[PDB]
Design an enzyme around this catalytic site. Sequence first.
Site, PDB file in Angstrom:
ATOM      1  N   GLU A 108     -70.864 -72.717  85.565  1.00 52.39           N
ATOM      2  CA  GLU A 108     -72.060 -73.126  84.872  1.00 52.39           C
ATOM      3  C   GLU A 108     -72.723 -74.315  85.592  1.00 52.39           C
ATOM      4  OE1 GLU A 108     -71.936 -73.598  80.584  1.00 52.39           O
ATOM      5  OE2 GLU A 108     -73.616 -74.814  80.761  1.00 52.39           O
ATOM      6  N   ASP A 125     -80.649 -83.310  78.966  1.00 52.59           N
ATOM      7  CA  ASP A 125     -80.302 -81.952  78.429  1.00 52.59           C
ATOM      8  C   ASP A 125     -80.568 -82.004  76.908  1.00 52.59           C
ATOM      9  OD1 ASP A 125     -79.023 -79.371  78.627  1.00 52.59           O
ATOM     10  OD2 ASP A 125     -77.089 -80.388  78.352  1.00 52.59           O
ATOM     11  N   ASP A 169     -80.677 -79.155  74.609  1.00 50.72           N
ATOM     12  CA  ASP A 169     -79.910 -78.094  73.966  1.00 50.72           C
ATOM     13  C   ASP A 169     -80.493 -77.766  72.596  1.00 50.72           C
ATOM     14  OD1 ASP A 169     -78.113 -77.999  76.175  1.00 50.72           O
ATOM     15  OD2 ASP A 169     -76.608 -79.128  75.057  1.00 50.72           O
ATOM     16  N   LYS A 220     -75.748 -77.063  86.460  1.00 51.32           N
ATOM     17  CA  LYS A 220     -76.465 -78.158  85.856  1.00 51.32           C
ATOM     18  C   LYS A 220     -76.802 -79.103  87.038  1.00 51.32           C
ATOM     19  CE  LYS A 220     -76.979 -81.254  81.862  1.00 51.32           C
ATOM     20  NZ  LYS A 220     -76.345 -82.198  80.901  1.00 51.32           N
ATOM     21  N   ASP A 247     -75.732 -68.818  78.541  1.00 47.69           N
ATOM     22  CA  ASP A 247     -75.877 -69.819  77.498  1.00 47.69           C
ATOM     23  C   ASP A 247     -77.392 -69.832  77.212  1.00 47.69           C
ATOM     24  OD1 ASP A 247     -73.036 -70.782  77.387  1.00 47.69           O
ATOM     25  OD2 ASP A 247     -73.607 -72.729  78.148  1.00 47.69           O
ATOM     26  N   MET A 276     -64.895 -66.216  75.019  1.00 48.85           N
ATOM     27  CA  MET A 276     -64.890 -67.127  76.180  1.00 48.85           C
ATOM     28  C   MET A 276     -64.149 -68.376  75.799  1.00 48.85           C
ATOM     29  SD  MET A 276     -66.599 -70.049  77.294  1.00 48.85           S
ATOM     30  CE  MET A 276     -68.239 -70.460  76.713  1.00 48.85           C
ATOM     31  N   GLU A 303     -77.549 -71.464  82.029  1.00 49.54           N
ATOM     32  CA  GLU A 303     -77.948 -72.002  80.772  1.00 49.54           C
ATOM     33  C   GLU A 303     -79.443 -72.254  80.882  1.00 49.54           C
ATOM     34  OE1 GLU A 303     -75.855 -75.171  78.517  1.00 49.54           O
ATOM     35  OE2 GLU A 303     -77.802 -76.136  78.358  1.00 49.54           O
ATOM     36  N   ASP A 327     -61.550 -79.141  71.919  1.00 51.41           N
ATOM     37  CA  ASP A 327     -62.317 -78.879  70.750  1.00 51.41           C
ATOM     38  C   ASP A 327     -61.340 -78.549  69.612  1.00 51.41           C
ATOM     39  OD1 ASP A 327     -64.847 -79.039  72.062  1.00 51.41           O
ATOM     40  OD2 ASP A 327     -65.199 -76.838  72.063  1.00 51.41           O
ATOM     41  N   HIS A 341     -63.759 -75.257  73.835  1.00 52.79           N
ATOM     42  CA  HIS A 341     -63.176 -76.029  74.929  1.00 52.79           C
ATOM     43  C   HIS A 341     -61.726 -76.345  74.405  1.00 52.79           C
ATOM     44  CE1 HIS A 341     -67.277 -77.940  75.091  1.00 52.79           C
ATOM     45  NE2 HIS A 341     -67.228 -77.814  76.360  1.00 52.79           N
ATOM     46  N   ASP A 389     -75.525 -72.129  73.371  1.00 44.03           N
ATOM     47  CA  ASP A 389     -74.992 -73.463  73.667  1.00 44.03           C
ATOM     48  C   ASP A 389     -76.105 -74.449  73.238  1.00 44.03           C
ATOM     49  OD1 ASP A 389     -73.775 -75.768  74.550  1.00 44.03           O
ATOM     50  OD2 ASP A 389     -74.007 -75.555  76.608  1.00 44.03           O
ATOM     51  N   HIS A 401     -80.630 -75.905  81.462  1.00 43.45           N
ATOM     52  CA  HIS A 401     -80.140 -76.406  82.749  1.00 43.45           C
ATOM     53  C   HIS A 401     -81.034 -75.984  83.878  1.00 43.45           C
ATOM     54  CE1 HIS A 401     -75.744 -77.040  81.309  1.00 43.45           C
ATOM     55  NE2 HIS A 401     -76.605 -77.771  80.614  1.00 43.45           N
TER      56      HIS A 401
HETATM   57  O1  LIG Z   1     -67.817 -75.288  79.033  1.00 39.42           O
HETATM   58  C1  LIG Z   1     -69.204 -75.187  79.310  1.00 39.42           C
HETATM   59  C2  LIG Z   1     -69.916 -76.216  78.461  1.00 39.42           C
HETATM   60  S1  LIG Z   1     -69.106 -77.776  78.844  1.00 39.42           S
HETATM   61  C3  LIG Z   1     -70.122 -79.052  78.081  1.00 39.42           C
HETATM   62  O2  LIG Z   1     -69.799 -79.002  76.684  1.00 39.42           O
HETATM   63  C4  LIG Z   1     -71.553 -78.818  78.448  1.00 39.42           C
HETATM   64  O3  LIG Z   1     -72.438 -79.831  78.056  1.00 39.42           O
HETATM   65  C5  LIG Z   1     -72.173 -77.431  78.400  1.00 39.42           C
HETATM   66  O4  LIG Z   1     -73.512 -77.259  78.849  1.00 39.42           O
HETATM   67  C6  LIG Z   1     -71.364 -76.291  78.947  1.00 39.42           C
HETATM   68  O5  LIG Z   1     -71.876 -74.992  78.504  1.00 39.42           O
HETATM   69 MN   LIG Z   2     -73.928 -74.720  78.500  1.00 39.49          MN
HETATM   70 MN   LIG Z   3     -77.099 -78.081  78.098  1.00 35.82          MN
END
Ligand SMILES: OC[C@H]1S[C@H](O)[C@H](O)[C@@H](O)[C@@H]1O
Ligand SMILES: [Mn+2]
Ligand SMILES: [Mn+2]
Lengths: 393, 393, 393, 393
Positions: free
Chosen positions: A179, A253, A255, A181, A243, A86, A215, A55, A52, A291, A218
């Site tokens: 993306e 979320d 992850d 969510k 992702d 990306m 993702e 970042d 990002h 991700d 998501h």
């Molecule tokens: O830029 C896409 C990123 S933005 C953010 O950090 C988010 O929580 C992620 O799920 C996304 O993949």
């Molecule tokens: Mn993501």
């Molecule tokens: Mn996520």
Amino acid sequence: VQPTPADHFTFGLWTVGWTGADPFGVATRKNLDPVEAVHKLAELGAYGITFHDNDLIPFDATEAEREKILGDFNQALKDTGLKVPMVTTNLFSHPVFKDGGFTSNDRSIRRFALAKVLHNIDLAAEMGAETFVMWGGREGSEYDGSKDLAAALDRMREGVDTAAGYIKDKGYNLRIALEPKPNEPRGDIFLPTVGHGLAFIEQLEHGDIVGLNPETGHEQMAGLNFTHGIAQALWAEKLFHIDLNGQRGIKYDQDLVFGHGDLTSAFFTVDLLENGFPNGGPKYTGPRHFDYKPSRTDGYDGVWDSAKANMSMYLLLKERALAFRADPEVQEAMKTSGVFELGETTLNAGESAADLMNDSASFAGFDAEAAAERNFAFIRLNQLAIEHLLGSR
Amino acid sequence: VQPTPADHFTFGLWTVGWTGADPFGVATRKNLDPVEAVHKLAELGAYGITFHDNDLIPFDATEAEREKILGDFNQALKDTGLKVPMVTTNLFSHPVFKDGGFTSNDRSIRRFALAKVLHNIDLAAEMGAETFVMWGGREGSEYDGSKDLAAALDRMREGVDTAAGYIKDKGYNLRIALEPKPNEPRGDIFLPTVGHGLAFIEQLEHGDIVGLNPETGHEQMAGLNFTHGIAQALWAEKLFHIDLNGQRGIKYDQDLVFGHGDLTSAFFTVDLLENGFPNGGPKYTGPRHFDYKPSRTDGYDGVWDSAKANMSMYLLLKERALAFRADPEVQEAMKTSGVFELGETTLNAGESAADLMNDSASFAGFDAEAAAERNFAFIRLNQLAIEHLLGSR
Amino acid sequence: VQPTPADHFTFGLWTVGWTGADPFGVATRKNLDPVEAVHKLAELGAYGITFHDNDLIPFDATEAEREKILGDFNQALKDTGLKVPMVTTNLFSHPVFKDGGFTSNDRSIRRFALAKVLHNIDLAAEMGAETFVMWGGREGSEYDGSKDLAAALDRMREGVDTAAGYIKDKGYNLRIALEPKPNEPRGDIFLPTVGHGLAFIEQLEHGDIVGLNPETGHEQMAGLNFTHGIAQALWAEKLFHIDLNGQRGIKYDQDLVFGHGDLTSAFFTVDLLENGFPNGGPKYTGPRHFDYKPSRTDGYDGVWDSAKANMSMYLLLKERALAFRADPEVQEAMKTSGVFELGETTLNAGESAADLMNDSASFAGFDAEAAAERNFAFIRLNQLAIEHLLGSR
Amino acid sequence: VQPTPADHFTFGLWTVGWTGADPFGVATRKNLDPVEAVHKLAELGAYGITFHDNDLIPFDATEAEREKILGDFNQALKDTGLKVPMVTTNLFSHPVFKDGGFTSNDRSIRRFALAKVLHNIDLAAEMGAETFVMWGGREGSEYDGSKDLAAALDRMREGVDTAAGYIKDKGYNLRIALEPKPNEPRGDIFLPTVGHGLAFIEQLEHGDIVGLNPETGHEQMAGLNFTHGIAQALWAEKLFHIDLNGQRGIKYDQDLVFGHGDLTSAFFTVDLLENGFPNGGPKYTGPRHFDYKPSRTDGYDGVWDSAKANMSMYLLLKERALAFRADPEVQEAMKTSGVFELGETTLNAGESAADLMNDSASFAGFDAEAAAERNFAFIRLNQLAIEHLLGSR
Ligand SMILES: OC[C@H]1S[C@H](O)[C@H](O)[C@@H](O)[C@@H]1O
Ligand SMILES: [Mn+2]
Ligand SMILES: [Mn+2]
Ligand SMILES: OC[C@H]1S[C@H](O)[C@H](O)[C@@H](O)[C@@H]1O
Ligand SMILES: OC[C@H]1S[C@H](O)[C@H](O)[C@@H](O)[C@@H]1O
Ligand SMILES: OC[C@H]1S[C@H](O)[C@H](O)[C@@H](O)[C@@H]1O
Ligand SMILES: [Mn+2]
Ligand SMILES: [Mn+2]
Ligand SMILES: [Mn+2]
Ligand SMILES: [Mn+2]
Ligand SMILES: [Mn+2]
Ligand SMILES: [Mn+2]
């Protein structure tokens, strides 16, 4: 195991860089330097890194600061060989984006957000990125009266089409990926699933260069089938990036590492990505981007373990999915279940709607009670997949 | 209260006709005759009735039986004046449809299902229906290996485009509406949300006459915001029909009376249907159809009470939503929150992507820290809606 | 509707004090001086305030600072008249508590966590609190092999029994209230629902002074019925405190204003708190506490507006719920539906099991098909409730 | 992997006997003769069979018919050697049970329901069952004002205590196992989770012989962790029976084959059943019972294949879970992570609360920032589990 750059395993700087601050507590790890991230990821077998804008470049940084930072970043890339496939923009951290970027009720925040995206397209192009990802995490509301819902979509379209027209105008070799969510940080986020994002792209002026970035976690937050969802993106020629991670249930979320959520679903995701469709069709050939966020209970050895584990998981499942499909017992089970039969068109070459209605063989004199006896044997076929997955066959 | 035909309240024959058989038990009420349904619905203020082919004509019926049945049906319609605005096909009850109609792995079941839909288009046209609804309840799977996912979408497209081309070929004044559902009866149903259905329509040859039929309870089974979802259908010019009911949570399809599920959400659904958007835009002008099931614990007086209650709920919320929007305190609260401001385009007439980037006012010299201080006052604005809803203002 | 201290509205310091930092972004509001929270809540009609040890006293506070801060906060209370009915400990924010306090894997951390609670009990006793809440937010895991689950419950038991044992030992007029949450921040939290909370309490050496602190949103996070869960807690006489807020579905903990989530559910919660059970039974008489967070999009008029929205919502629901039960029509409906027959014992006075099996009227010659004809009319009864809620009656 | 009766696999008659009727369609399979179920399960390696009174004996059976049927079923058992470890009552299918059995609003229905249970206890005792299961599937409501919630729990208590009292009175070697389900067929079911089940048991006069029968899918229907819920039940010594199956998310009760839902969760359930707790504790030794439904898409080879898939899945998970814990690498990881330190009491031998608060090492001079540095390494431990599960280790 052993990932190599040819596997196309990419990681966001924010994944391994995730320090542990959650809604109930402070960071549990020390900040990770981005040059350190690059050397460490390249040591592990990654092919590329994503980031990002904020970042790498603080919100605050001066041009002199920007250049100091990019030069070390670029040197590291040079010394290690990782690509930057990306790039994405942060339109969610700073208090200014509390109501969104592109769909902020405030017009001046909308212009600021679009400005920030435009500038980030220039860095994306300079980095050699093929994809520009847009995650609209603050676009939405907690309450239904907060927004004019048609105006919100109009504002979303205006942002995305301006960005798209700018790529086209400049001739950058870049595509936009949205993306989806469903919620969090907002109560309801706009374009919450793969479906809504695909649909939205069809209303755009510049939709030809706009696709999706689904993702795993998501779509699982809306309790959807991720393989089904990516299948429809693929089928539409819109699976531009992906992702991969894990989610155990409909909750915040998580992850998690890929394969540490819904394992069976992860196995079929790997089978679609690696193997494609049983009757042939489209194939996703982009990067396999993770991700995820390394659990906050773990220190830095857990960070690097977790990065490894994402790649091991994907290669272990790849292996089992190749054995599974290659298995002659499975191929025969597939044939019995009608998997290949789904591939035949319903109508005969040349038959019309009035020609089949009028075909006595498929309607008036069809034996529905006989046809209902068919044992599809879907349980047996699922049992063969699980047994290939357990390394049993 | 008092609904009149001008309100456009339509009910499916299967709603009031629902006898109570669920997965754990037998029917608790006696079958309802369709001529009885029509007289009773017309007595209550309904404008029209909808039905599935097998609601009226048994699967088994002979042509002589078909004609006996339609003549009484048509007489009743004549005697009462109710219209028949929508017709739909049963592609889920008979054991033959256990793997789906259109996406059945068996080719001969696929042809049988398409045959059955084609024939039902002819009855739809004869009835004066403007909409033909398609609910693909058995299209999907319990296991991920059961289907070739691209082939399933190809087979779905082939069915829908054949049906669509047949309407066009015959010149019927009919549109197709797809009705999304995430799961149940199948573990995963294809095109599970408004999003996936909208996206899917864009891949069709004959998409111009294909739109959606969203159901409140169905999007709430994926935990989505129903007002957001219908807003995107509307915005796309695809909200062709609607099913109104209630759902309390992510569980089995409950099909409660409209307003007996998520009440606040029902209030904003009514505000979008009746009032449209705060800045102006599209309006949904079709029938207000209730797809609900009268609780099995209740007898026939509960059936007719429940039919009434759907119409009362909708008129009570309509009333409160009209007072809410007309309220000058609310209009001012809206203005403070930026609801109208969302309506202004982000870019100035003529400004380009390079013109705004380069505008120092919206990027380089923008005060993000100042702009973040804005009190959007979304809580206050939600509090005014709830108070209008409670009949407090 | 204007709250008076008689109403017993209590607010956590952390609620109006919430800064706006979430997982995806920084604070949007400046820190709130506690002195100011006190004065402000006192002017809104609050009865009292609650806090976490670290909400007042920083982790690293020296003794001179701790004395000062307490001096300032006692002064504010003395000036305003606010009571302090509940105190709680922060066992989640410092990085040391990353695997929990009481159930951390590290023994030194478990001892430090229990010590932190014991000191906090002294403080609670010094402030005059009646209730001591334990929210085990870091107690649980992301992964199934992380913990010895029997040992996690013994460790939870040890800490809670020591705290309870210490209370009795010191003669404090304090009860412990456990507060369930199913997930967030951990993937799975131990004692995730009211049921699990109640069940664990029965294995405690000092369970007599250990009860529950259910939170609206937390039970809705697992899709349960908040009213049913507090009804089981009441019935077991273990409803020691309650946290009122709103949640719109199975997702991250929203902490919306009470009544800004599931409205009908709020309505029936208020009826249970105000009217008690239809046939009589225990009644809750503690504080009506709000554990919410002012949406981060809102600035300081929004904070006091949201505070006030909680008390307005509660008073509006209360007005309606008293009206609802006082209505003759409602009482009649209640009668019909068997709400009062549920209160009659099934057996007759001194009728044994054997007596009932042998009674021929109850089994052998019971007419099951005639008894199934009852029209329970629960839909009409639900319609009456909603009409009272909407103020149309 | 081949099951032997030593394995203790038990199957409900209703499981392989499931006809395929669901809410949207009719049966897809012919009824199964119970005699045939018995013989077939006996050839697959089943240890025993379980049934519902109406699975065997029709509602309206005359005494000559009841005698016959029992004669036939006892014959089959005698021939095959199958045991009957659990019996249960159908209090949900007849229309009389539309508002429940035990907690129906109608008193005559509650008496008939309790009488039906008492007779069924005799039968259970006659078949040699050790367990009597009560699934209160119709106990609950669709609407919040339908019931007096305190009175619904007294009515549940009355029925369960009478049944328990009768058992003791007759000297039967029978325990009652309650089985939670959160929703379906009612919108909200009472005692919805393991926690609520355990909590209610503590208010019973005869709770000593009343325990739990948790079902995998039912706890997953509220998004809970099945392994954590049975761990609380074990720990309280109330895990009397268990129902194993699969569920893929928060939706209608799927009843998939064990291992065909959440795979990792299944893996850790099997480890808990086979290995017990890492630091020791109670162990479950009852039947491994499968409450699943052969997918309706499958015909009779599919039914026996699905039966067999349950036992194969269980044996495969068991092989892996024994391997997993026997691995030195796993044991080392377990040590590092503090799995065995969780088992050490927090307090020292005769250390009181006062003793710990005064200990300076545990609080006053505890180095919190140094203790937060521990790398719990739970991710690596989770990776090891998955690698054992996938048979790659
Ligand atoms: O830029 C896409 C990123 S933005 C953010 O950090 C988010 O929580 C992620 O799920 C996304 O993949
Ligand atoms: Mn993501
Ligand atoms: Mn996520
Ligand atoms: O035809 C559309 C009908 S089909 C079926 O009765 C279903 O359960 C409904 O939700 C859909 O509205
Ligand atoms: O201790 C009471 C608090 S602790 C923490 O602030 C939490 O998120 C809450 O839901 C609780 O109610
Ligand atoms: O009584 C045990 C049975 S009753 C009923 O068949 C139910 O749906 C199940 O989940 C239970 O396990
Ligand atoms: Mn429905
Ligand atoms: Mn519908
Ligand atoms: Mn909360
Ligand atoms: Mn709380
Ligand atoms: Mn089940
Ligand atoms: Mn069961």
